[PDB]
Amino acid sequence: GRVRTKTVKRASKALIERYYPKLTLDFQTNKRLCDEIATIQSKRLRNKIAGYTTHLMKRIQKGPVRGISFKLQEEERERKDQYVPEVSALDLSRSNGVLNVDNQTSDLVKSLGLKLPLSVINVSA
Amino acid sequence: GQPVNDFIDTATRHVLMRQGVLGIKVKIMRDPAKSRTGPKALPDAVTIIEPKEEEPILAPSVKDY
RNA sequence: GGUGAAAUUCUUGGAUUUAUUGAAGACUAACUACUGCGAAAGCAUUUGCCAAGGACGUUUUCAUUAAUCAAGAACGAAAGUUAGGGGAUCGAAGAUGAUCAGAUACCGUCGUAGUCUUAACCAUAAACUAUGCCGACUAGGGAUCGGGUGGUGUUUUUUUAAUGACCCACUCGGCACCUUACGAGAAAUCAAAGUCUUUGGGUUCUGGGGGGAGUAUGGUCGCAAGGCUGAAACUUAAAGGAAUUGACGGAAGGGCACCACCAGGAGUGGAGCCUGCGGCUUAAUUUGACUCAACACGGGGAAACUCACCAGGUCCAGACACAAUAAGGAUUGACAGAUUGAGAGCUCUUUCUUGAUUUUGUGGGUGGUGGUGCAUGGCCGUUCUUAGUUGGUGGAGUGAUUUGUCUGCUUAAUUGCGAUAACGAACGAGACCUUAACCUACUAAAUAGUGGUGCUAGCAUUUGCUGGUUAUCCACUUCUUAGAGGGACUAUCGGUUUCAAGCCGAUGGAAGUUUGAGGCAAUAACAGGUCUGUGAUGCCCUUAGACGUUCUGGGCCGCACGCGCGCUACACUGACGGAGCCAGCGAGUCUAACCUUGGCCGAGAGGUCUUGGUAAUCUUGUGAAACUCCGUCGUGCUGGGGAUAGAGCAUUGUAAUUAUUGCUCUUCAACGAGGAAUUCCUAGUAAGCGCAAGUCAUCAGCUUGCGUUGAUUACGUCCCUGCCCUUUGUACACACC
């Protein structure tokens, strides 16, 4: 019956969301830090909040936890997503400069498109 | 629980009408923010002090006097 | 055999079982499907005749020959009109055997009419798709059956060829199916149940609230059962359809609970007693409460009081307004005697006093533990030891309503992880508060202790041990106290899960079940209890010979009997006598006799003289009890048990008889471990044991707490009794009593 209530969980998630580079991975200085940077009425509640807060970083440093963005996980993510490969995936260099479409695509570009380097593949059953 | 003793106040009054007696029960809670003595918030209320942002480089050097 | 169990029945005359060989008895098990044919009823292994049919193909033919149809016909599920055969599997009936209160039923065994003749049904079915037939249009999709068309398709073999079978595409015609809802509908739902108040394609049949009633009567078919046709009198305010929310189910799924069980423990129900309830009795045996949720409950352990009941005796404390008597006296009180339970001037004899406040009448006032808790307020109990409850905005539906408030996993928890036509919230839970655990860390205590120092005792003597010394003095807070704090958050590690919420194991820790236990505690409700707690109260009653109030006695306790909560025992793990001696929660008196130390007297109960205490100071270390040694007892209703009863001594009380209670001697009953039933309980717990407080003047076998000793058994399940959620059925909504 050690399930934490939503009061502990929402406060601990709110603490990590804005105070990641101040808390460590041990409960002793985490409960010491929560006395100044947070206002908790009872000693039993702040021990439960700091205990769950330390438990949350027992897996945050293990891997990215869904639903928590702690001001450190953000800026390496909008650093990562501008993946510009040095070569394209649609420029015909791993091929011989010619894309190997089938017969039905050849008269498609013959009817409406302009002349391009194509091949003919006998695709069937 | 204990917040009922702190913030909740009650009064019971018997009025006398023609048909009999009507009972009046009034329950009022004041918000704990205006409380002068005792706790100033609910026991399950947690407030987070907003942190102050800092710039990353901070120009490594020494200043003397 | 046969059944939930059994029984009927057959069995050395060999049952049942095994083999071989025969003979009569629907139909065609598997194949068998959201597949085919037929007008419907209906029709399944073959093979052969006899006619029939749909669909497709068609540059064949007729040319309106058609659609629906009163009258009129044909065809037909099965179950018995009637007349041969063959031979029971099932039960009508019938026989039996069970079950049951009965069981003429369900279930078991057997068996006649009863889907096998050849020959009629008058023609009845929930004969159903509960949906007439013909024609046109309106929307997408994938399958499938029959036919046809096409493929520089596959396979079968001669190499490909011809077929066949398969694959792709299309088309016609079918049995259907899936998605939406433009559209319909009251909704359920529906590609028709659409194209309908923007109401007309053609046509046939039926209905006009529920019954009476498919009845009466007439006809007709009818050797029969019975069909087909078919009213009225009278009666009635609903009957009915679909859906929503609850409740319920001998419905299903998921969980939970020692007010459920499991495994056990201690018991209760058996005995004596005392304590409530009923019944009986009585002058009265006051009364409320009757499953959980009445019955050691009304804080209800009643001698008077309480007290509401009974037999009697007083008093007005009936205020005020009006009227009348009335300073030639409105009225009150009383000596003595009578009277009275009575030293009540109650009332009377007598004659004193008082005097304008009183008396009488008219209105009212007041009081009532008089009635109504089914007129109410407040309080409490219960539903309900569970986790549930509700707005806002948005979505669905005509609407009641619904979603949010949930598939799954997890939790003690609607606790969370999450998924999501919901998002964001509120109450409940949790959080919180109190108490018990840890602190050689702080704050310092002659109203708590500790060590040394002085004085002094006993032994040893060697410098030691056990003490005493109200403050002799000094020092400290480990023990005790109480302020502020700290500490646990499941910490660390390992293992499991979707890799999360979590769960389990180990270590460390005073503490790992929410740390143990409480307090508090939702929305809605009960004709739950209380008018006998209240100067809380409406309405009704009474109000002077009072239902007010007071006083004297009695009753609440009365006992052929029944029930509930308990106490003491049935003995040797014990009784009795000495010895050791070990706690915690608390209470205690200024104008009043409270808790009582100590000294003396007494067998005891108790008496007497003082003292301390308004209290961490004194009672008090409450020197409690079970417990532990040593001894007596010796398997015997015995020395277990102390019920019942007799005599005496004391205490409280105005009063003790109907024994208040305490003590002494004697009397020495039932009871030999308690049937059906039934209660409570998972760790400092049950159980054993006593102590303080409430009530108290006296009485505790009761209750609220406390400490002493201290276990067996589980770490589960829904089997019994209940509870929460989901699905489901409902003719229930006073809600399965």
mmCIF file of N, CA, C and O (backbone and C1' of nucleotides) in Angstrom, chain A residues 1-7 9 13 27-28 31-32 42-48 51-52 55 58-59 62 66, chain C residues 411-413 415-419 429-432 486-492 500-503 512-515:
data_model
loop_
_atom_site.group_PDB
_atom_site.id
_atom_site.type_symbol
_atom_site.label_atom_id
_atom_site.label_comp_id
_atom_site.label_asym_id
_atom_site.label_seq_id
_atom_site.Cartn_x
_atom_site.Cartn_y
_atom_site.Cartn_z
ATOM 1 N N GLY A 1 0.801 -1.209 0.000
ATOM 2 C CA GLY A 1 0.000 0.000 0.000
ATOM 3 C C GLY A 1 0.835 1.261 0.000
ATOM 4 O O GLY A 1 0.443 2.276 0.571
ATOM 5 N N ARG A 2 1.996 1.198 -0.653
ATOM 6 C CA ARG A 2 2.928 2.316 -0.701
ATOM 7 C C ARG A 2 2.725 3.196 -1.926
ATOM 8 O O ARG A 2 3.678 3.834 -2.392
ATOM 9 N N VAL A 3 1.509 3.249 -2.460
ATOM 10 C CA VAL A 3 1.228 4.031 -3.658
ATOM 11 C C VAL A 3 1.109 5.499 -3.283
ATOM 12 O O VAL A 3 0.361 5.862 -2.368
ATOM 13 N N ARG A 4 1.849 6.348 -3.986
ATOM 14 C CA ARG A 4 1.808 7.775 -3.716
ATOM 15 C C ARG A 4 0.555 8.402 -4.315
ATOM 16 O O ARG A 4 0.070 7.991 -5.372
ATOM 17 N N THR A 5 0.030 9.405 -3.622
ATOM 18 C CA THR A 5 -1.142 10.126 -4.084
ATOM 19 C C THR A 5 -0.750 11.123 -5.168
ATOM 20 O O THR A 5 0.429 11.363 -5.431
ATOM 21 N N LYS A 6 -1.764 11.709 -5.808
ATOM 22 C CA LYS A 6 -1.494 12.669 -6.872
ATOM 23 C C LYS A 6 -0.948 13.978 -6.325
ATOM 24 O O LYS A 6 -0.358 14.755 -7.078
ATOM 25 N N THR A 7 -1.131 14.243 -5.031
ATOM 26 C CA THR A 7 -0.548 15.441 -4.438
ATOM 27 C C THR A 7 0.970 15.332 -4.388
ATOM 28 O O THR A 7 1.684 16.301 -4.667
ATOM 29 N N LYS A 9 2.763 13.200 -6.349
ATOM 30 C CA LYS A 9 3.291 12.978 -7.692
ATOM 31 C C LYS A 9 3.285 14.256 -8.522
ATOM 32 O O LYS A 9 4.235 14.516 -9.269
ATOM 33 N N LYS A 13 6.676 16.137 -9.798
ATOM 34 C CA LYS A 13 6.853 16.407 -11.221
ATOM 35 C C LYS A 13 7.044 17.895 -11.476
ATOM 36 O O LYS A 13 7.805 18.284 -12.367
ATOM 37 N N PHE A 27 18.355 11.054 -1.145
ATOM 38 C CA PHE A 27 17.194 11.657 -0.502
ATOM 39 C C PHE A 27 17.595 12.674 0.559
ATOM 40 O O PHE A 27 16.815 13.583 0.868
ATOM 41 N N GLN A 28 18.813 12.563 1.098
ATOM 42 C CA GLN A 28 19.197 13.366 2.255
ATOM 43 C C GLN A 28 19.323 14.846 1.912
ATOM 44 O O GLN A 28 18.778 15.696 2.626
ATOM 45 N N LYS A 31 15.687 16.245 0.497
ATOM 46 C CA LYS A 31 14.766 16.732 1.514
ATOM 47 C C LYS A 31 15.295 17.974 2.211
ATOM 48 O O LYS A 31 14.504 18.739 2.771
ATOM 49 N N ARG A 32 16.609 18.195 2.186
ATOM 50 C CA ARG A 32 17.151 19.432 2.727
ATOM 51 C C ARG A 32 16.894 20.596 1.784
ATOM 52 O O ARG A 32 16.641 21.718 2.232
ATOM 53 N N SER A 42 3.885 19.971 6.256
ATOM 54 C CA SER A 42 4.207 18.929 7.217
ATOM 55 C C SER A 42 5.504 18.224 6.849
ATOM 56 O O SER A 42 5.890 18.163 5.679
ATOM 57 N N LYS A 43 6.172 17.694 7.876
ATOM 58 C CA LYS A 43 7.421 16.969 7.666
ATOM 59 C C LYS A 43 7.182 15.641 6.962
ATOM 60 O O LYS A 43 8.032 15.178 6.194
ATOM 61 N N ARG A 44 6.041 15.004 7.228
ATOM 62 C CA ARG A 44 5.733 13.732 6.582
ATOM 63 C C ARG A 44 5.488 13.915 5.091
ATOM 64 O O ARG A 44 5.863 13.059 4.282
ATOM 65 N N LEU A 45 4.860 15.027 4.708
ATOM 66 C CA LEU A 45 4.590 15.272 3.297
ATOM 67 C C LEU A 45 5.867 15.588 2.531
ATOM 68 O O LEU A 45 6.055 15.105 1.409
ATOM 69 N N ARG A 46 6.759 16.393 3.115
ATOM 70 C CA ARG A 46 7.978 16.758 2.400
ATOM 71 C C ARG A 46 8.951 15.592 2.312
ATOM 72 O O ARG A 46 9.781 15.553 1.399
ATOM 73 N N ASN A 47 8.870 14.639 3.241
ATOM 74 C CA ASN A 47 9.660 13.422 3.101
ATOM 75 C C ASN A 47 9.126 12.555 1.971
ATOM 76 O O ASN A 47 9.895 11.889 1.270
ATOM 77 N N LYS A 48 7.804 12.542 1.786
ATOM 78 C CA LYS A 48 7.217 11.755 0.708
ATOM 79 C C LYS A 48 7.467 12.401 -0.645
ATOM 80 O O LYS A 48 7.679 11.705 -1.644
ATOM 81 N N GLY A 51 11.222 11.949 -1.328
ATOM 82 C CA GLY A 51 11.493 10.550 -1.603
ATOM 83 C C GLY A 51 11.057 10.132 -2.993
ATOM 84 O O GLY A 51 11.760 9.387 -3.677
ATOM 85 N N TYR A 52 9.888 10.604 -3.429
ATOM 86 C CA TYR A 52 9.448 10.321 -4.789
ATOM 87 C C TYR A 52 10.237 11.125 -5.809
ATOM 88 O O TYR A 52 10.422 10.670 -6.943
ATOM 89 N N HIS A 55 13.330 9.223 -6.338
ATOM 90 C CA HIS A 55 13.004 8.014 -7.085
ATOM 91 C C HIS A 55 12.799 8.316 -8.563
ATOM 92 O O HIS A 55 13.094 7.476 -9.422
ATOM 93 N N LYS A 58 15.980 8.389 -10.239
ATOM 94 C CA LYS A 58 16.586 7.070 -10.358
ATOM 95 C C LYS A 58 16.307 6.444 -11.718
ATOM 96 O O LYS A 58 16.999 5.498 -12.108
ATOM 97 N N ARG A 59 15.309 6.951 -12.446
ATOM 98 C CA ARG A 59 15.051 6.532 -13.812
ATOM 99 C C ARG A 59 15.218 7.639 -14.844
ATOM 100 O O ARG A 59 15.294 7.330 -16.036
ATOM 101 N N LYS A 62 18.475 7.243 -15.912
ATOM 102 C CA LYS A 62 18.492 5.995 -16.667
ATOM 103 C C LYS A 62 18.019 6.217 -18.099
ATOM 104 O O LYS A 62 18.595 5.665 -19.042
ATOM 105 N N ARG A 66 8.627 9.938 -19.878
ATOM 106 C CA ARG A 66 7.542 10.596 -20.592
ATOM 107 C C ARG A 66 6.738 11.487 -19.652
ATOM 108 O O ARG A 66 6.405 11.097 -18.530
ATOM 109 P P U C 411 -1.431 -4.596 -5.597
ATOM 110 O "O5'" U C 411 -1.999 -3.359 -4.777
ATOM 111 C "C5'" U C 411 -1.121 -2.375 -4.257
ATOM 112 C "C4'" U C 411 -1.876 -1.168 -3.768
ATOM 113 C "C3'" U C 411 -2.972 -1.434 -2.755
ATOM 114 O "O3'" U C 411 -2.479 -1.628 -1.443
ATOM 115 C "C1'" U C 411 -3.751 0.076 -4.401
ATOM 116 P P A C 412 -3.105 -2.774 -0.511
ATOM 117 O "O5'" A C 412 -4.671 -2.499 -0.572
ATOM 118 C "C5'" A C 412 -5.565 -3.142 0.322
ATOM 119 C "C4'" A C 412 -6.532 -2.155 0.921
ATOM 120 C "C3'" A C 412 -7.053 -1.094 -0.033
ATOM 121 O "O3'" A C 412 -8.182 -1.556 -0.751
ATOM 122 C "C1'" A C 412 -6.374 -0.101 2.023
ATOM 123 P P A C 413 -8.235 -1.453 -2.348
ATOM 124 O "O5'" A C 413 -8.753 0.027 -2.608
ATOM 125 C "C5'" A C 413 -10.016 0.441 -2.115
ATOM 126 C "C4'" A C 413 -10.103 1.939 -2.008
ATOM 127 C "C3'" A C 413 -9.702 2.719 -3.248
ATOM 128 O "O3'" A C 413 -10.751 2.809 -4.198
ATOM 129 C "C1'" A C 413 -8.672 3.664 -1.336
ATOM 130 P P U C 415 -9.844 7.440 -4.771
ATOM 131 O "O5'" U C 415 -8.395 6.817 -4.592
ATOM 132 C "C5'" U C 415 -7.505 7.316 -3.611
ATOM 133 C "C4'" U C 415 -6.095 6.852 -3.861
ATOM 134 C "C3'" U C 415 -5.443 7.354 -5.136
ATOM 135 O "O3'" U C 415 -4.926 8.663 -5.000
ATOM 136 C "C1'" U C 415 -5.050 5.032 -4.894
ATOM 137 P P G C 416 -4.694 9.584 -6.292
ATOM 138 O "O5'" G C 416 -3.280 9.119 -6.848
ATOM 139 C "C5'" G C 416 -2.992 9.171 -8.236
ATOM 140 C "C4'" G C 416 -2.119 8.017 -8.647
ATOM 141 C "C3'" G C 416 -1.858 7.865 -10.136
ATOM 142 O "O3'" G C 416 -0.821 8.712 -10.597
ATOM 143 C "C1'" G C 416 -2.419 5.768 -9.195
ATOM 144 P P C C 417 -0.729 9.120 -12.146
ATOM 145 O "O5'" C C 417 -0.230 7.796 -12.874
ATOM 146 C "C5'" C C 417 1.097 7.324 -12.707
ATOM 147 C "C4'" C C 417 1.341 6.087 -13.532
ATOM 148 C "C3'" C C 417 1.060 6.230 -15.016
ATOM 149 O "O3'" C C 417 2.138 6.820 -15.716
ATOM 150 C "C1'" C C 417 0.062 4.244 -14.208
ATOM 151 P P G C 418 1.850 7.757 -16.981
ATOM 152 O "O5'" G C 418 1.528 6.724 -18.145
ATOM 153 C "C5'" G C 418 0.516 6.997 -19.099
ATOM 154 C "C4'" G C 418 -0.370 5.798 -19.312
ATOM 155 C "C3'" G C 418 -1.501 5.982 -20.306
ATOM 156 O "O3'" G C 418 -1.072 5.812 -21.643
ATOM 157 C "C1'" G C 418 -2.335 4.979 -18.339
ATOM 158 P P A C 419 -1.499 6.871 -22.768
ATOM 159 O "O5'" A C 419 -2.827 6.249 -23.383
ATOM 160 C "C5'" A C 419 -2.887 4.879 -23.747
ATOM 161 C "C4'" A C 419 -4.310 4.392 -23.796
ATOM 162 C "C3'" A C 419 -5.286 5.296 -24.531
ATOM 163 O "O3'" A C 419 -5.278 5.078 -25.930
ATOM 164 C "C1'" A C 419 -6.186 4.724 -22.434
ATOM 165 P P A C 429 -12.591 11.759 4.456
ATOM 166 O "O5'" A C 429 -11.785 10.713 3.578
ATOM 167 C "C5'" A C 429 -12.127 9.340 3.597
ATOM 168 C "C4'" A C 429 -11.225 8.550 2.691
ATOM 169 C "C3'" A C 429 -9.741 8.669 2.987
ATOM 170 O "O3'" A C 429 -9.322 7.797 4.021
ATOM 171 C "C1'" A C 429 -10.112 8.997 0.681
ATOM 172 P P G C 430 -8.281 8.298 5.133
ATOM 173 O "O5'" G C 430 -7.055 8.839 4.284
ATOM 174 C "C5'" G C 430 -6.093 7.945 3.752
ATOM 175 C "C4'" G C 430 -5.172 8.651 2.796
ATOM 176 C "C3'" G C 430 -4.325 9.759 3.389
ATOM 177 O "O3'" G C 430 -3.188 9.294 4.090
ATOM 178 C "C1'" G C 430 -5.338 10.555 1.441
ATOM 179 P P A C 431 -2.865 9.872 5.553
ATOM 180 O "O5'" A C 431 -2.481 11.394 5.291
ATOM 181 C "C5'" A C 431 -1.377 11.734 4.465
ATOM 182 C "C4'" A C 431 -1.474 13.146 3.943
ATOM 183 C "C3'" A C 431 -1.436 14.241 4.989
ATOM 184 O "O3'" A C 431 -0.131 14.528 5.455
ATOM 185 C "C1'" A C 431 -3.217 14.663 3.525
ATOM 186 P P C C 432 0.212 14.374 7.017
ATOM 187 O "O5'" C C 432 -0.893 15.260 7.743
ATOM 188 C "C5'" C C 432 -0.902 16.672 7.605
ATOM 189 C "C4'" C C 432 -2.135 17.278 8.219
ATOM 190 C "C3'" C C 432 -2.232 17.174 9.727
ATOM 191 O "O3'" C C 432 -1.473 18.172 10.381
ATOM 192 C "C1'" C C 432 -4.300 16.555 8.760
ATOM 193 P P G C 486 12.646 19.189 12.450
ATOM 194 O "O5'" G C 486 13.758 18.093 12.156
ATOM 195 C "C5'" G C 486 15.132 18.410 12.291
ATOM 196 C "C4'" G C 486 15.925 17.217 12.750
ATOM 197 C "C3'" G C 486 15.590 15.906 12.067
ATOM 198 O "O3'" G C 486 16.213 15.781 10.804
ATOM 199 C "C1'" G C 486 15.740 15.572 14.402
ATOM 200 P P G C 487 15.412 15.139 9.574
ATOM 201 O "O5'" G C 487 15.247 13.612 9.987
ATOM 202 C "C5'" G C 487 16.371 12.748 10.023
ATOM 203 C "C4'" G C 487 16.059 11.474 10.761
ATOM 204 C "C3'" G C 487 14.976 10.606 10.148
ATOM 205 O "O3'" G C 487 15.445 9.813 9.073
ATOM 206 C "C1'" G C 487 14.554 10.858 12.449
ATOM 207 P P A C 488 14.873 10.055 7.592
ATOM 208 O "O5'" A C 488 13.327 9.721 7.729
ATOM 209 C "C5'" A C 488 12.418 10.027 6.680
ATOM 210 C "C4'" A C 488 11.270 9.049 6.629
ATOM 211 C "C3'" A C 488 10.306 9.087 7.810
ATOM 212 O "O3'" A C 488 8.999 8.768 7.338
ATOM 213 C "C1'" A C 488 11.262 6.940 7.647
ATOM 214 P P C C 489 7.934 9.936 7.066
ATOM 215 O "O5'" C C 489 7.912 10.093 5.481
ATOM 216 C "C5'" C C 489 7.724 8.973 4.630
ATOM 217 C "C4'" C C 489 8.525 9.106 3.359
ATOM 218 C "C3'" C C 489 8.425 7.936 2.391
ATOM 219 O "O3'" C C 489 7.288 7.999 1.548
ATOM 220 C "C1'" C C 489 10.698 8.555 2.688
ATOM 221 P P U C 490 6.418 6.682 1.246
ATOM 222 O "O5'" U C 490 7.339 5.470 1.703
ATOM 223 C "C5'" U C 490 8.085 4.718 0.756
ATOM 224 C "C4'" U C 490 9.130 3.885 1.450
ATOM 225 C "C3'" U C 490 10.300 3.407 0.605
ATOM 226 O "O3'" U C 490 11.283 4.418 0.442
ATOM 227 C "C1'" U C 490 9.511 1.657 2.015
ATOM 228 P P A C 491 12.377 4.340 -0.735
ATOM 229 O "O5'" A C 491 13.776 4.393 0.032
ATOM 230 C "C5'" A C 491 14.302 5.621 0.521
ATOM 231 C "C4'" A C 491 15.703 5.451 1.062
ATOM 232 C "C3'" A C 491 16.594 4.496 0.284
ATOM 233 O "O3'" A C 491 17.255 5.156 -0.780
ATOM 234 C "C1'" A C 491 16.676 3.962 2.595
ATOM 235 P P U C 492 17.546 4.401 -2.165
ATOM 236 O "O5'" U C 492 18.588 3.268 -1.770
ATOM 237 C "C5'" U C 492 19.919 3.601 -1.410
ATOM 238 C "C4'" U C 492 20.716 2.360 -1.127
ATOM 239 C "C3'" U C 492 20.597 1.271 -2.177
ATOM 240 O "O3'" U C 492 21.449 1.481 -3.286
ATOM 241 C "C1'" U C 492 20.280 0.331 -0.036
ATOM 242 P P A C 500 10.329 2.313 -16.883
ATOM 243 O "O5'" A C 500 9.377 3.267 -16.038
ATOM 244 C "C5'" A C 500 8.765 2.805 -14.845
ATOM 245 C "C4'" A C 500 7.326 3.242 -14.757
ATOM 246 C "C3'" A C 500 6.644 2.974 -13.429
ATOM 247 O "O3'" A C 500 6.890 4.019 -12.511
ATOM 248 C "C1'" A C 500 5.234 2.314 -15.232
ATOM 249 P P A C 501 7.197 3.700 -10.973
ATOM 250 O "O5'" A C 501 5.781 3.861 -10.269
ATOM 251 C "C5'" A C 501 4.896 4.903 -10.648
ATOM 252 C "C4'" A C 501 3.464 4.495 -10.433
ATOM 253 C "C3'" A C 501 3.201 3.720 -9.157
ATOM 254 O "O3'" A C 501 3.053 4.567 -8.036
ATOM 255 C "C1'" A C 501 2.171 2.620 -10.979
ATOM 256 P P G C 502 3.888 4.272 -6.702
ATOM 257 O "O5'" G C 502 3.174 2.984 -6.102
ATOM 258 C "C5'" G C 502 3.912 1.819 -5.771
ATOM 259 C "C4'" G C 502 3.235 0.582 -6.299
ATOM 260 C "C3'" G C 502 3.602 -0.719 -5.615
ATOM 261 O "O3'" G C 502 2.888 -0.914 -4.409
ATOM 262 C "C1'" G C 502 3.682 -1.013 -7.955
ATOM 263 P P C C 503 3.641 -1.463 -3.105
ATOM 264 O "O5'" C C 503 3.850 -3.009 -3.410
ATOM 265 C "C5'" C C 503 2.739 -3.880 -3.530
ATOM 266 C "C4'" C C 503 3.155 -5.233 -4.043
ATOM 267 C "C3'" C C 503 4.223 -5.945 -3.231
ATOM 268 O "O3'" C C 503 3.693 -6.601 -2.091
ATOM 269 C "C1'" C C 503 4.772 -6.055 -5.531
ATOM 270 P P G C 512 9.766 -2.583 11.840
ATOM 271 O "O5'" G C 512 9.331 -2.312 10.334
ATOM 272 C "C5'" G C 512 8.164 -1.554 10.043
ATOM 273 C "C4'" G C 512 7.835 -1.552 8.570
ATOM 274 C "C3'" G C 512 8.022 -2.881 7.839
ATOM 275 O "O3'" G C 512 6.989 -3.028 6.866
ATOM 276 C "C1'" G C 512 9.330 -1.212 6.799
ATOM 277 P P U C 513 5.720 -3.961 7.174
ATOM 278 O "O5'" U C 513 4.543 -3.317 6.315
ATOM 279 C "C5'" U C 513 3.783 -4.112 5.409
ATOM 280 C "C4'" U C 513 2.297 -3.856 5.516
ATOM 281 C "C3'" U C 513 1.879 -2.404 5.756
ATOM 282 O "O3'" U C 513 0.681 -2.132 5.031
ATOM 283 C "C1'" U C 513 0.995 -3.776 7.460
ATOM 284 P P U C 514 0.684 -1.052 3.844
ATOM 285 O "O5'" U C 514 0.709 0.352 4.596
ATOM 286 C "C5'" U C 514 1.352 1.476 4.006
ATOM 287 C "C4'" U C 514 1.051 2.763 4.736
ATOM 288 C "C3'" U C 514 1.301 2.752 6.244
ATOM 289 O "O3'" U C 514 1.846 4.007 6.643
ATOM 290 C "C1'" U C 514 -0.935 3.377 5.811
ATOM 291 P P U C 515 3.418 4.135 6.936
ATOM 292 O "O5'" U C 515 3.627 3.295 8.270
ATOM 293 C "C5'" U C 515 4.477 2.159 8.284
ATOM 294 C "C4'" U C 515 4.562 1.541 9.655
ATOM 295 C "C3'" U C 515 3.277 1.513 10.463
ATOM 296 O "O3'" U C 515 2.392 0.476 10.075
ATOM 297 C "C1'" U C 515 5.058 2.240 11.835
#
